[PDB]
Design an enzyme around this catalytic site. Structure first.
Site, PDB file in Angstrom:
ATOM      1  CB  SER A  73      -0.856   0.053   1.379  1.00  0.00           C
ATOM      2  OG  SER A  73      -0.067   0.510   2.390  1.00  0.00           O
ATOM      3  CG  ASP A  74       1.302   5.754  -1.404  1.00  0.00           C
ATOM      4  OD1 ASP A  74       2.225   5.876  -0.788  1.00  0.00           O
ATOM      5  OD2 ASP A  74       0.951   6.373  -2.558  1.00  0.00           O
ATOM      6  CD1 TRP A  75       5.182   5.485   4.764  1.00  0.00           C
ATOM      7  CD2 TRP A  75       4.862   4.147   3.224  1.00  0.00           C
ATOM      8  NE1 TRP A  75       5.985   4.768   4.722  1.00  0.00           N
ATOM      9  CE2 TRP A  75       5.894   3.703   3.710  1.00  0.00           C
ATOM     10  CE3 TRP A  75       4.410   3.473   2.024  1.00  0.00           C
ATOM     11  CZ2 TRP A  75       6.909   2.769   3.250  1.00  0.00           C
ATOM     12  CZ3 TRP A  75       5.239   2.310   1.575  1.00  0.00           C
ATOM     13  CH2 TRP A  75       6.450   1.877   2.066  1.00  0.00           C
ATOM     14  N   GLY A  76      -0.058   4.715   4.699  1.00  0.00           N
ATOM     15  CA  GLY A  76      -1.575   5.157   4.932  1.00  0.00           C
ATOM     16  C   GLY A  76      -2.854   4.952   3.904  1.00  0.00           C
TER      17      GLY A  76
END
Ligand SMILES: [Cl-]
Ligand SMILES: [Cl-]
EC number: 3.2.1.21
Lengths: 750, 745
Positions: free
Chosen positions: B228-231
């Site tokens: 995933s992208d961060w968050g």
């Protein structure tokens, strides 16, 4: 009278009521001889009467009773003259009364989304305000004579290709602001007896059975009291159509659908009140026509011919006039070149085609206006019979142009290019006509091009010519009107009602016309016509509202009633227009409204007012405009109503959409506030925009923003932008309670 | 086989913990089973490994590493080899700093010039983007470390990127946005793919099963894992079922507790979890096998590479009267705040702490020599003044040539937010206009990550587009300005005259957490070509100090099938006096097709080096995909039989040679007809037309309608007419139902 209408419907049988909701033949309604309900006739069309003769086949479209062929809507709209259009409407009504026609199948008021649409010649404008105003004028005139007008085609019938099966996909806001808007004020200000539904589908449903279209918008919201007729053969499911609001099916189906109505009522699927309401709408118009029937009506065919001459002369558009070549001098030698001199293009093709009572000859009318001191020479130049090249014609035309003092080339679109039923495929003049203009411009620098065409055309030679006269389809008196304007007997005052792009590919619909697989999507949305070119910064060949004059008009002293106004308020705009030239003429004053800042995307400016004033040399008069809430409102789909976002609005008054001369700022405010619903996936910045919700989240966010040492007034920092874009659920990931967040979201909405 | 045996030994808590991060950059270790912890970090054009003694929010405080040209400028090289070498240099630096996965490259399509991260993306064209992304991945992974392709997918704006619902039709995705990633996955096989923050048609990319599983893992056969992208994770369980293997950064066990609870409840199958764990473990142990202990790299050689990468990707947009290359004589004036504080990289998570940094003045003075008089004038200040302008005008007039260094300041371009306009600061525009008044021989060097408006373009002789050239920008500028390097860069994106011209303008950045790509396929030059809108500088445009003449275009075949392959040949000859590299560009045009497709689309490019007078042959191979569009009905790439033009040129608007080809297919799409089908559409199927022809022929003659008159209304009414209306033109409804049955059968 309405009390007698209800008494008649009580006496009708179910079979009689269902038969009335369908035609008797191709043009007549079914009579009810038992109850004295007569049969009325309806026929085309928008710019002239086309009543088919008795001994004529149904497909013989042009075999009709002679009647006046007025300038078609595309050219007539360039008058911007509500009065002139109403007078033409009244002349159409007089001819209907004389030929025992109760309903004229006009006017056409569809929006010009693409220049290629086949029926653009019989439509008014690409702008819903200019279209609705002139359509309303047309209806008022027709119905002032005691006969009905039929507004068509409702709605979004903006292409002929697959018009009977295509699914037209248009978002709600685009409909309310553009396509519905073209019809809205025509219904409200002119109250036409009939509205005709379109052949196409609108968002999944045929217009003939589109209850949102016919009942919710037209009959309930706009309060259309007449009845709704289908386009010819546009009925699909008759019972569904009757419930949706389609009152009269045309043409006749020989009782097939009538039996479906009776069986559905007796089965219980269709309420009888739905049928009675449609019969009542139809009977109201039938008896209103009988009440206003003029026995042994006659019209003056010569007086209508002169009106058609005035209507054409006052709607021709002087697009270019370098070195003031027009008006022509009544001396020397003048060369007329072009096949359109002898076989001119003056109307379109299709169900609106007129058999004219007369037809002016261009050469003779010009010779008549020229006089003895003018030597008139003609050269064919190009041939319409063959789309080829003939250098003998070009060489003879160049020799005729060189010997003359001025050369006038008559070019445009041949008859086959424009018609009901199919669209154009390109936007250019035949090449043999373009080769001629360029050839004549080589040997005669003083060259005038007269264009005969129903829709915009490309002009690659525009820099090689001095004058371009756009006459559109000027009707049966085109020749006289051409002679009047060319020699200055009439000072041209027409201004374009649609944008002339440089290239077809520039136009907003180009990538989505005519669609694919029985489907077309208006992905340009609001940005139709000049709305597109203005916002995109694309320069058209000639912009919307462009038109020159043999004189000059100076605008000055722009006035405004108020400067701070509310939704329910009204602003009055004033401007002084002065003829600073030597020749009298009419000037079309145009008012545009610009929303300098709004949360929703809107065009650069939108036309909200226009007037035409006559000014003698040196004369100055004050022109007034009134600005409604609708002059500043967009359609808000959330509240399902027109909304004005508080902000600054510019009142732009000019001679064209790209010749603004005076401006004034006003501030319009609203008491209406849109409530935004927030969730756990809502952006932090969006919630902090509501001061009520910001009071709930502000303190909580302050704890996290300082703990992360992030500046939130730095509009050029990544982490500041990450906090703004964050959904509320991500805030709990820093420091909060998942249940506490859900309570904060509930309080924010409350 | 050993991986599956390890998964059998893991507990449920350990399996769920592996699918989430340990901290901001590391995976969770499993010391019980010998599963080590690996680190991933940014970024696409340089390594940004955060230091040990650094605050957690200190984004820029990182270990020094080579700052290469960002993707926007590097893509203008059109050189797959050069990009792969930069990737390999990135891999060596990861090995030296014990990084197992580089969070790069970024390969999102440039839909709008305003997108904040355009500086670290490759192109507006999916073929150029996919090819160079594949080169970048091959380079990184040739060194034994993984690349992470990002951001999948349709992350084409920074405004509301974490909540916006991106509305894109299927065909546009397949041909433009998915296509940018497709061949990068297929040809380079990156170990990791990163999902985007945004929603794609109602679903977050982090839990978009069609996106991660159906397209990426199943169709394209991505064997690595998806991070995933961060968050960017929303519902972790939904994401795991959708195909999101690794959540980053750590959530401190919050989402781990949801995975274990969902497995024990029975809502989430353990086979789904084991499959994700296997994807993560496969990459973990593949990194461990290729780990190079105590690796060191040549910091000087990577600096020279960064200098070569910039010098071979700068774009000479304009060069009137051959002002460039500058003569090694006379007086040269360097004007601009960017002389001392040049713009050489972007802002955001990809920001690099450079190991070195060239000085523009010193490198130019070094390349100029004794015979050059070098004068400097500040000209403008980035902090905020006619005194600076007046002093700069005197310096330009006194000089034989003036070189102005302008562009976008650092605050303009960054991750997290988009640009709001497309123009360089006005104090810089006023300066260029003033210098152009008193010094006609003026060169403008542009430092910027994304397209800019140039209202002064007619007032200047030469425009050198350096984009963000990296830490060796100064030397590369000296190499190109004096001709030590013959510039060979050509634009990887269209430079519009006005921002409002660009296709996304009316639909960017959208409204109310929603943006709709209503321009569809027509992104970049696809829009300008088909619309006939003249850009300021078109896609693929780039000048050289020499001239290249194209000749003898050859084609393998002229009649080809769907499953066939064509080979294209062209001869390029350097007809100038100076050696240089030429980017040959191949476009394919579909002259006639039922679906709307752009005027032409790039399907091949090669770069050849030619000494003066030298001629070489360039070859291209044309796949089925070179002529196919995406057909949503059959859900497959389709080639409509017809003529195709092979356009070879020096830019998208400088086509020099053409060849006609005829491509055919035996695949035919079957259309199903109903009573509401148009008569002309039914007459398009020769089988069904045989059923309807006779009945229609009776009606056509009875009405005396000519059906070969394509400009007649009644003929056009019969074509548009639905079959049900035929009964109104005389027929039987029951016979019509039988006719419809025979047509479908
Ligand atoms: Cl419409
Ligand atoms: Cl993308």
């Amino acid at each position: 009278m309405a009390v007698d209408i209800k008494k008649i419907i009580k006496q009708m049988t179910l079979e009689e009521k269902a038969g009335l909701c369908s035609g008797l033949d191709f043009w007549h309604t079914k009579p009810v001889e038992r109850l004295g309900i007569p049969s009325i006739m309806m026929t085309d069309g928008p710019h002239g009467l086309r009543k088919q003769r008795e001994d004529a086949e149904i497909a013989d479209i042009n075999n009709s009773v002679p009647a006046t062929c007025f300038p078609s809507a595309a050219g007539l709209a360039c008058s911007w003259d509500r009065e002139l259009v109403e007078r033409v409407g009244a002349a159409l009504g007089e001819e209907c009364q004389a030929e025992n026609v109760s309903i004229l199948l006009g006017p056409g008021a569809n929006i010009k989304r693409s220049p290629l649409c086949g029926r653009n010649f019989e439509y008014f404008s690409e702008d819903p305000y200019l279209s609705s105003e002139l359509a309303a004028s047309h209806i008022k005139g027709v119905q002032s004579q005691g006969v009905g007008a039929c507004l068509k085609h409702f709605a979004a019938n903006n292409q002929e290709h697959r018009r009977m099966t295509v699914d037209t996909i248009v978002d709600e806001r685009t409909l309310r602001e553009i396509y519905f808007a073209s019809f809205e004020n025509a219904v409200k200000k002119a109250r036409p007896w009939v509205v005709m539904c379109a052949y196409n589908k609108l968002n999944g449903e045929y217009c003939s059975e589109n209850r949102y279209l016919l009942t919710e918008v037209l009959k309930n919201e706009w309060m259309h009291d007449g009845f709704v007729v289908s386009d010819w053969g546009a009925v699909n499911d008759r019972v569904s159509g009757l419930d949706a609001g389609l009152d009269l099916e045309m043409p006749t189906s020989h009782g097939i659908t009538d039996k479906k109505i009776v069986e559905a009522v007796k089965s219980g699927k269709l309420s009888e009140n739905i049928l009675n309401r449609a019969v009542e709408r139809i009977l109201k118009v039938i008896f209103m026509a009988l009440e206003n029937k003029k026995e042994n009506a006659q019209y003056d065919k010569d007086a209508h011919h002169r009106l058609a001459r005035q209507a054409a002369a006052e709607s021709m558009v002087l697009l270019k006039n370098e070195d003031d070549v027009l008006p022509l001098k009544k001396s020397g030698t003048i060369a007329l070149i072009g096949a359109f001199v002898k076989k001119p293009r003056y109307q379109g093709s299709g169900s609106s085609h007129i058999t004219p009572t007369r037809l002016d000859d261009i050469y003779e009318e010009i010779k008549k206006a020229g006089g003895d001191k003018v030597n008139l020479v003609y050269s064919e130049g190009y041939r319409l019979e063959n789309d080829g090249i003939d250098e003998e014609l070009i060489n003879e035309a160049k020799k005729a142009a060189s010997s003359s003092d001025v050369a006038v080339v008559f070019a445009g679109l041949p008859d086959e290019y424009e018609s009901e039923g199919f669209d154009r495929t390109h936007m250019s003049i035949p090449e043999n006509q373009n080769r001629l203009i360029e050839a004549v411009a080589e040997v005669q620098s003083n060259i005038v091009v007269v264009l005969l065409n129903g829709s915009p055309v490309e002009m690659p030679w525009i820099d090689k010519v001095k004058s371009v006269l756009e006459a559109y389809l000027g009707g049966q008196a085109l020749g006289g009107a051409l002679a009047d304007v060319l020699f200055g007997e009439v000072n041209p005052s027409g201004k374009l009602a649609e944008t002339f792009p440089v290239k077809l590919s520039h136009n907003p619909s180009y990538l989505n016309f005519p669609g694919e697989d029985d489907r077309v999507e208006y992905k340009e949305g609001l940005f139709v016509g000049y709305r597109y070119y203005d916002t995109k910064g694309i320069e058209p060949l000639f912009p919307f509202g462009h038109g020159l004059s043999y004189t000059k008009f100076e605008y000055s002293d722009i006035s405004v009633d108020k400067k701070d106004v509310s939704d329910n308020s009204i602003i009055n705009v004033s401007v002084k227009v002065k003829n600073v030239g030597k020749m009298a003429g009419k000037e079309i004053v145009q008012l545009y409204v610009k929303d300098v800042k709004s949360s929703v995307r809107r065009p650069e400016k939108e036309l909200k007012g226009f007037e035409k004033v006559f000014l003698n040399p040196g004369e100055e008069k004050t022109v007034t405009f009134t600005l409604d809430k609708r002059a500043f409102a967009y359609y808000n789909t959330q509240i399902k109503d027109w909304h004005v976002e508080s902000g600054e609005f510019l009142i732009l008054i000019g001679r064209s959409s790209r010749d603004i001369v005076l401006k004034e700022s006003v501030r319009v405010n609203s008491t209406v506030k849109i409530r935004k619903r927030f969730t756990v996936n809502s952006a932090v910045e969006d919630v902090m925009s509501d001061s009520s919700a910001a009071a709930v989240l502000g303190p909580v966010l302050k704890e996290i923003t300082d703990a992360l040492q992030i500046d939130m007034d730095n509009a050029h920092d990544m982490m500041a932008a990450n906090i703004k874009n964050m959904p509320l659920r991500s805030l709990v990931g820093y420091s909060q309670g998942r249940l506490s967040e859900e309570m904060l979201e509930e309080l924010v909405d409350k």
